[PDB]
């Protein structure tokens, strides 16, 4: 049934069900909930641990990214979703200061599809942050031929897109995106980008970026997942699987 981000089952750890535990997907806009009430039902030693961490809304993301265990990261993500709602949903308001980071990553790195016809709608959308309304409508034919049949030329732009998205969804989202880059399974990105589109409908540039990510994900190519040989630094195991509840 529904996933519980406080205690997550071993079968449930996948990019999709983890994607369901992201902070913005919790649909909490307002009225922050204090940490002791968030963790209220959980082991006592765990509660004392979280109090000893002295989480704040600013650095909770750093705690998520530094942790080595995915269940704990999801827990901190849920604590962020209940504790810091304005921070979580700020990115969706157009030209809010949360957008500056992924916009800057867009300007800093140019797609390989943009070295041919730099005036393509998307290339202007990442370059100048203008004409972002519909990126996948304009020149889609040309991009469709460019990306189709080429694994490498597609993986390059996909990776850069994955970095910008790392800056769009901090915390859990970031780590999931990292998983993509390492596992080279790029279709799982749907679960991240899909949920991002309905919240972002007000933001024009974000909506355009997400529509294009939808487009380049729909490219016609066959790429092989490369799960890690170590089996470590992956979601399944090892090692510890904390369950708070």
């Amino acid at each position: 049934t529904s996933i519980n981000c406080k205690n997550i089952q071993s079968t449930q750890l996948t990019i999709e069900h983890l994607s369901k535990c992201m902070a913005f997907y919790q649909n909490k806009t307002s009225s922050p909930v204090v940490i002791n009430e968030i963790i209220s039902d959980a082991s006592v030693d765990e509660q004392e641990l979280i109090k000893s961490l002295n989480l704040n809304c600013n650095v909770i993301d750093r705690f998520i990214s530094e942790s080595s265990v995915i269940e704990t990261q999801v827990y901190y993500e849920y604590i962020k979703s209940q504790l810091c709602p304005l921070q979580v949903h700020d990115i969706f308001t157009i030209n809010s200061a949360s957008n500056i980071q992924w916009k800057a990553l867009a300007r800093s790195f140019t797609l390989g599809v943009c070295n041919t016809n730099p005036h393509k709608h998307i290339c202007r959308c990442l370059e100048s942050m203008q004409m972002c309304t519909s990126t996948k409508t304009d020149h889609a034919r040309e991009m469709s031929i460019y990306y189709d049949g080429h694994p490498d030329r597609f993986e390059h732009d996909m990776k850069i897109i994955l970095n910008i998205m790392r800056y769009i969804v901090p915390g859990l989202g970031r780590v999931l995106l990292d998983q993509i880059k390492q596992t080279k399974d790029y279709q799982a990105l749907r679960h991240i980008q899909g949920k991002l589109s309905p919240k972002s409908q007000s933001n024009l540039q974000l909506k355009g970026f997400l529509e294009f990510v939808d487009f380049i994900l729909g490219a016609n190519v066959t790429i092989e997942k490369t799960p890690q040989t170590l089996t470590t630094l992956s979601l399944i195991g090892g090692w510890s699987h904390p369950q708070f509840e």
Partner: antibody
Amino acid sequence: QMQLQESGPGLVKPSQSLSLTCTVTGYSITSDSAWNWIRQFPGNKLEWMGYISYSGSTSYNPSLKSRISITRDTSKNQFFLQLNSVTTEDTATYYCTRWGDGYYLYWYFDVWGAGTTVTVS
Amino acid sequence: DIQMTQTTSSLSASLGDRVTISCSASQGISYYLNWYQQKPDGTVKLLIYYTSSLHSGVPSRFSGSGSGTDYSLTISNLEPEDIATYYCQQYSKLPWTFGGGTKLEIKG
């Protein structure tokens, strides 16, 4: 249901320390939050002086960082401000408040003292 | 460090009016802001925390708003107990700073 009060001398003329005692009634400083001293200068200008945490961590405004000291007594459940090398600029109304850490209650200044006006020269 | 500026130092309005007080920030605070009321006798009590949220016990007439570097406090209908000096605070990062303050007065 807690309340705080500041107990302090009326004035000290310059080159001396000014010390105040914030007594916290109805709460345990050990248990949680951050305990702060905040002075309002004449003309209604507010300045955050510094705080001591529930665990004893100290953070001071870098403007005052040299001469300011904030201690606490867990026994009588008090915490003390000492601002040394006072000048005529330090004349002001000094409060002591509680900044909540995000654990038991959100981040803000919750309970405030009535304030004690201490003067220089 | 982070300088908070209240554009209006003092303001007068009649009772029952709708008063708005503006708080500007030197840089982006990312929503971390508080609103305090210092009455004439000197008692200071928290009005608004986290920029939207209204503290427990504060009357329904007060509403916070704003985002980014710009923030607003709104008293919907002005009652005589509200006459006082108002302050805004950024907890973004230390050292914490306060606005210049806005004193309310009666027309009346």
